[PDB]
């Protein structure tokens, strides 16, 4: 193992490097998409349409 | 500068090297190894420094063996091992206005197609 | 050292304009580009004067035109000239790409300019039809309903693109909007591409038509050819405003002067005529995807030619077989076009398949062999003739 | 018969111009890096198109919950 | 029209169809071709019914 | 690339050759580069390293006629004219002045196009 | 000054890259002492006359196209016709 | 430094790797996001739904 395998792997190449460059980009958009609604769903706690349904049309 | 690229770009070559170009190295050091020992001042400085730096005056037979065992994969694990993509030491004198700094001249150690 | 040659822009107008060694026996066939040219010149001066009074809409660009014409200051002047240049410029595109074609200007060293030149055709033809659909006549209407819809046949995504253009689900004011928003900036682009085309081609220097190298005797270009494109300008600004003051409607159908109705499909739905060839090609295949493929190559088989001439003589001057062929071509590509620009009855759809069987033929077979034959032919008798 | 008659272990391949089925031979690799590459960008570049993320994300179990709509019954008009 | 896309005329024609005076080829009641050149039968869009109206696309 | 002529094959059969001279002397007649005094290796390109390599090695005298021959075909061709009938090209003169020494340099460099591809069978 | 470019064959002035010249005479005259329009009609006629009699025959035989055009037209119309349909 | 070669270059490349996925994701956030403009806006959207009265006819 040591770090001259991770160099063998992906650091080698320039076709093994742009390869993991767009995976980890890939990967990275998702993580942040779930980050940034997580922290938003967090930060609004009964000031949406979606938490103020009951009290207005539920009692019609 | 084209100087400088194209000779790193030729080291850097040696990872991909053919099996002719090996063989025929393969010969001409073969040759050339015991070609250079005429006088006898030259084959006792020989003699010397074989025993000093090692401890044994390697037979004909051996420096033979050893060289046949050569083939192009070794040439090429050893080139990148050792060339592609590795520090360099440089020194330049006289007149080397034109002569690229550091960061360019390593920068062509590796080719970057493959 | 004289300023021409020491300030920097007056030395790069010096080395394209004043002095360039150039060959000394070029024929009048070499002033097309020239005219080019300027008809660029004025095309892009014009829409810039027209873009100033015209409203990209589907219920007002028809009533905008017709306020220019009738209501705006000299307003027909500007339209007809924008239009006759518009038709002038195909017709010198066509004379540009015949000279380069018989002369045989595609070989080395001069095939960057070449594929250049090819680009640069594709880009005007592009250009030319959201130019001609903005008035949003009869014709404008139907043939961009046609011709868009075309954009469908690729595997995949296919009506998502032609739903993307429209920006809708039909023609209406969102494409009229994209278009007339397009329709300004290709022009620039295809200015650029015109400078990297002539600074492509400045490198290696023009040819001649013997076809042999011209470094022994070369001239100027300030004194000389200056003056030998003076007449061309001339006899062009002739022929236009003789359209423009007498014709001004003169390669323009009936059918390009009504409102764009949606509900009445016309008898004929054809592009302008300058169009009229590859919508024949277009047109023969009974085949969907076919037609649209061999649309396209009957345009991208240009940048095939420099590997299909097997001649060691560059040019046709000297090919007896060659001005043969060349001539048969042009006479196919005029078939062709009356073809597509008539009604697909009963004869015509066998006339237009043979004419577009012909047309795929000569670059793909004829060229090679005739080359070849000519070659075979001269060096056998050149062999035979001291025994 | 023989290219180098005193060696024969020698010979000459098939070739155009330097290209070589030997040469050839060692450039696959690369080419089949650049393709997954390439393919990879192209999957990078187009994965909020609605077509493609219906079709070949969404069924993909694991990420298709993230690549799925939330929207209730306040939907479109 | 599926044959070249012109406007007939309802109830025109002896099958109680559409007629297409462009070439001369009728249809029926039930809008399915019999009469003329045409290729094809015509094309009915997706609905749903809903009270008393009808939404169409 | 390069042309491809084939007057070799047919040269094998006489009686192609026979059968084809009057054909060949008519296309000759008909090409019309005579008429300009022009050999016919005045009309190979010359822009790629072969040929640039070929026209400097060779003689002096045949260089300055050749230079000659253009500079009059140019000259001629500026005003649209030809030569009169006695000045055109005769064929003891239409000779091959430029195809052994390009044969020669295209042949020095195949020579190098075979050491690089070499290979070891074992 | 700027840098050493790649190979092309065009040059300058004085290095045009053509080959080595030796003995040629030219001569020629001022145009303020030469009438122009001298010569003109004759040249301009022998010229065109043997252009049109040498490549005369590589573009008339534009020769069968207008054939096939009037056939195709006559027999398009002649079949669009009452008796066309028996 | 005190190390060995290989551990200082891998280290230098992580970071650029980084800034490619980040920048990737970024551009291609962007282009989507600015070239959806083209597509049917919201407008003619509401638009594309027809009513018509079964009873009317
Ligand atoms: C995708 C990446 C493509 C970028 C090109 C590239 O990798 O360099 C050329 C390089 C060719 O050189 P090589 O033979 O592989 O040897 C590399 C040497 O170190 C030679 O390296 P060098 O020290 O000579 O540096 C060359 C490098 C200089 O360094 C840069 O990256 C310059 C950055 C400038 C703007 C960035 C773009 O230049 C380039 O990157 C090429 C031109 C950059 C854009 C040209 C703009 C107009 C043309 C369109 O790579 C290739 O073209 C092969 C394929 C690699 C990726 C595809
Ligand atoms: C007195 C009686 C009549 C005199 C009145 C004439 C006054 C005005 C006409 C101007 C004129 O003839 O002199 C200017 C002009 C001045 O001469 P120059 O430009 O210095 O000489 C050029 C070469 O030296 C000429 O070299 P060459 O003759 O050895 O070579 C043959 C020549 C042409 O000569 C011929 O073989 C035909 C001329 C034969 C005369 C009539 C014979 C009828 C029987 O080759 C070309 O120049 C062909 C041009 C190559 C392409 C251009 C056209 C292609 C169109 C493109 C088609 C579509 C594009 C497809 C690609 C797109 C696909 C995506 O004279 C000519 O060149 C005359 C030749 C024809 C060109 C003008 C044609 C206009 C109408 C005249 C019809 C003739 C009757
Ligand atoms: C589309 C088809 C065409 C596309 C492109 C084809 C070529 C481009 C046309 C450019 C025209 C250039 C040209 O010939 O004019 C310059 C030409 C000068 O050329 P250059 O420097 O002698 O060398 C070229 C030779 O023409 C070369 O001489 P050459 O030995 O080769 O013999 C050819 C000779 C042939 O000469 C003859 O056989 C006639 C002999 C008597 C001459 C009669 C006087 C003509 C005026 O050419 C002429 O003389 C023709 C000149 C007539 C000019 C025509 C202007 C308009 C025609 C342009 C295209 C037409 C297409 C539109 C069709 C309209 C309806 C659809 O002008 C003259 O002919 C001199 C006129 C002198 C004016 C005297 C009054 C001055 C008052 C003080
Ligand atoms: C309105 C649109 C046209 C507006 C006008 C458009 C035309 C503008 C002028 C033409 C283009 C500019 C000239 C370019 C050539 C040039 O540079 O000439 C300058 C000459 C000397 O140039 P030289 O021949 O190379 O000699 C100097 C060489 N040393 C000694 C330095 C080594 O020195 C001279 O003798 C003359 C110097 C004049 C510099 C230009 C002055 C600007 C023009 C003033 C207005 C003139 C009157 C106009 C009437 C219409
Ligand atoms: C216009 C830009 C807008 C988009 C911005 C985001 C771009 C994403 C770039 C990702 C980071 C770069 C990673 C490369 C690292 C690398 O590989 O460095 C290697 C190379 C050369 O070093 P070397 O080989 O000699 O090292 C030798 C090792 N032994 O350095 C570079 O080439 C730097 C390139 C950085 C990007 C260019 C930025 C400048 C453009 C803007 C200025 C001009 C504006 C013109 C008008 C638009
Ligand atoms: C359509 C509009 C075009 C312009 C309108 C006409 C312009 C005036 C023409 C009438 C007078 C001409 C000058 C007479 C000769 C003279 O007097 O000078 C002679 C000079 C040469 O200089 P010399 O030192 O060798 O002269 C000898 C000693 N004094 O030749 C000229 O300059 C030619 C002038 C023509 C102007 C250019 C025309 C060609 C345009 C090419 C377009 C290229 C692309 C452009 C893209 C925008
Ligand atoms: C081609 C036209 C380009 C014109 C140039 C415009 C100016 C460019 C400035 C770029 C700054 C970001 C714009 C905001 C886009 C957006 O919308 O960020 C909003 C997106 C949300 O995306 P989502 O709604 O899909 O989330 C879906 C939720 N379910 O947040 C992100 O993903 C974060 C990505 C990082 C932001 C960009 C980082 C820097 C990129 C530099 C490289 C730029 C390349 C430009 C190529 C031309
Ligand atoms: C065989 C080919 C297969 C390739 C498939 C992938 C192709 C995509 C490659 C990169 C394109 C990125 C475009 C970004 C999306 C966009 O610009 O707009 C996205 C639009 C609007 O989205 P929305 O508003 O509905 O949702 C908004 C969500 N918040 O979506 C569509 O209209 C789908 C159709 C767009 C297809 C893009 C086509 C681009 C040119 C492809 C050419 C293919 C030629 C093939 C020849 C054989
Ligand atoms: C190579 C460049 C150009 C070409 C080939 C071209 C072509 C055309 C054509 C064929 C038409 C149809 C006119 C008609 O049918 O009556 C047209 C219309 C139009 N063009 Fe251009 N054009 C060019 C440049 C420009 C430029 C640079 C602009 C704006 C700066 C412009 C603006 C317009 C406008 C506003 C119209 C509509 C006015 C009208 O149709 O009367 N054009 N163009
Ligand atoms: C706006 C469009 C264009 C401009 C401004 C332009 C400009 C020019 C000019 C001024 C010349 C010199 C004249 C000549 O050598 O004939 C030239 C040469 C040339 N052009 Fe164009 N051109 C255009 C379009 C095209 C097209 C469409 C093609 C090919 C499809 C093309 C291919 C060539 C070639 C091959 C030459 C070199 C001819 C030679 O050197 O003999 N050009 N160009
Ligand atoms: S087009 Fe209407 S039936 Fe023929």
Redesign the interface.
Known sequence: M???T??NI??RRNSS??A???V???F??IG?DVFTDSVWKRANAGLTWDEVKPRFLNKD | DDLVHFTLQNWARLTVATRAEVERAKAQLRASLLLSLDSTTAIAEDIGRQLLTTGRRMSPQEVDLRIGQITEKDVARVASEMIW???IAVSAVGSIEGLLDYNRIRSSISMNRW | MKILKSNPFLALANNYMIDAPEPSNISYFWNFGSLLACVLVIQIVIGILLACFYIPNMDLAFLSVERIVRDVNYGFLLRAFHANGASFFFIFLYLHIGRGLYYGSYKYPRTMTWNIGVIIFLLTIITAFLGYCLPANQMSFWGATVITNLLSAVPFIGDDLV???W???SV?N?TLN?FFSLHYLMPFVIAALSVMHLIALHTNGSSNPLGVTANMDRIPMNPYYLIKDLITIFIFLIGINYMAFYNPYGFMEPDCALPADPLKTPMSIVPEWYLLPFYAILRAIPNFQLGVIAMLLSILVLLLLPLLDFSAIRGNSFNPFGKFFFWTFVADFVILAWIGGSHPENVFITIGAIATIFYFSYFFILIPVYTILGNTLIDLNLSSIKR | ISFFPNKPMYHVQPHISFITPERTMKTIPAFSRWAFAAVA?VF??????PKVKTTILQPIAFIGDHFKDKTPEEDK? | CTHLGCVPIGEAGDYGGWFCPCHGSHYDISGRIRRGPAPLNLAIPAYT?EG?????? | MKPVSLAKYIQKSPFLTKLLLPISNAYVHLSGYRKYGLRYDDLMLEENDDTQKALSRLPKMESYDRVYRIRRAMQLSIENKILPKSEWTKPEEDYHYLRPVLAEVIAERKEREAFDALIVKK | GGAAGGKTYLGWWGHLGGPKQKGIITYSLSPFQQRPMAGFFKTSTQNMFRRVMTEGLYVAIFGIAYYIYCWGKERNEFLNSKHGRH | TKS????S??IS?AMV??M??????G???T??DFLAS????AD?L?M????????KI
């Open positions: 040591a770090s001259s991770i160099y992906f650091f490097f742009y993991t460059i767009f980890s980009a890939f990275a958009k942040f | 993509d590795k520090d | 739903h993307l253009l920006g809708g689900f209406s969102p994209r | 960008g990078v570049f187009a994965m909020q198109v008009w | 019914f008393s109206k009808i939404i169409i696309g | 060995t070669g290989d551990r270059r891998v490349y790797g980084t490619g996925a980040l920048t990737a994701a551009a291609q956030a282009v989507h083209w597509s049917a806006s003619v509401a594309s739904k027809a009513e018509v009265d079964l009873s």
